[PDB]
Amino acid sequence: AEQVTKSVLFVCLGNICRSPIAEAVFRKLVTDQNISDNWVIDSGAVSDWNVGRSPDPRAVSCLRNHGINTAHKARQVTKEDFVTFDYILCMDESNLRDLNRKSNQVKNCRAKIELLGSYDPQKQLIIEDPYYGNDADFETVYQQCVRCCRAFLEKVR
C-alpha cells in the first residue's frame, strides 16, 4: 500500500459544535477504509472566541452515541492553512464568505474552499448551527456530516 498524501480542514464559526463532528466522522471513515496513512485531517474556527476549548458536551456525547471519540481543542484558522490544505470544507455561507475573504490576503493560496453540504446526495446545502438547539439537532448535524463526508471521500479518494 502506497499513494499520495491529501489533507482536509473542516471549518465552522467556533470549531466547537460542527467541525469537530465533521472531523471525527471523517477520521473514522478514513480509518475504516484503511487509508489514514494518507490523510492529514483537522478542524478549525473562523472565530478566535473559543480557542483552546474542548467541544460542546453535546457534540461529544453525540459522537459517543455513534461509537466515535475526539480529543480536539478549538483552534483558529490561520493564513498557512490556505497553503497547506488541499481542501477547506465549511458549514455555511457565512463561513464561506469569511474564508474567501481571508484567503485573499494569501498570495499562493492553493486550498480549494467549499461548502461541505455541496457534497450532500440529499442536497441539504447548509449545516445549521446547533449551538442553541437540542440533542436532536446535533444528531441531525452528525447525519449530514456522514452523508457529505462519504460523498466527498468517494470523489477525491
Curated annotation (Swiss-Prot):
E.C. designation(s): 3.1.3.48, 3.1.3.2
Active-site residues from the entry: C12 (nucleophile), R18, D129 (proton donor)
Gene3D superfamilies: 3.40.50.2300
Principal cellular location given in the protein's record: cytoplasm
Annotated protein name in UniProt: Low molecular weight phosphotyrosine protein phosphatase
Keywords per UniProt: Acetylation, Cytoplasm, Hydrolase, Phosphoprotein, Protein phosphatase
GO CC annotation: cytoplasm
Subunit-structure text: Interacts with EPHA2; dephosphorylates EPHA2. Interacts with EPHB1. Interacts with the SH3 domain of SPTAN1.
Regulation: Inhibited by sulfhydryl reagents.
Consequence when changing H72E: Decreased activity
Organism: Bos taurus
Post-translational modification: Phosphorylated by LCK. Phosphorylation at Tyr-131 increases its phosphatase activity.
Compartment annotation: Cytoplasm
Modified residues (N-acetylalanine): A1
SUPFAM superfamilies membership: Phosphotyrosine protein phosphatases I
Reactions catalysed, as given in the entry: O-phospho-L-tyrosyl-[protein] + H2O = L-tyrosyl-[protein] + phosphate; a phosphate monoester + H2O = an alcohol + phosphate
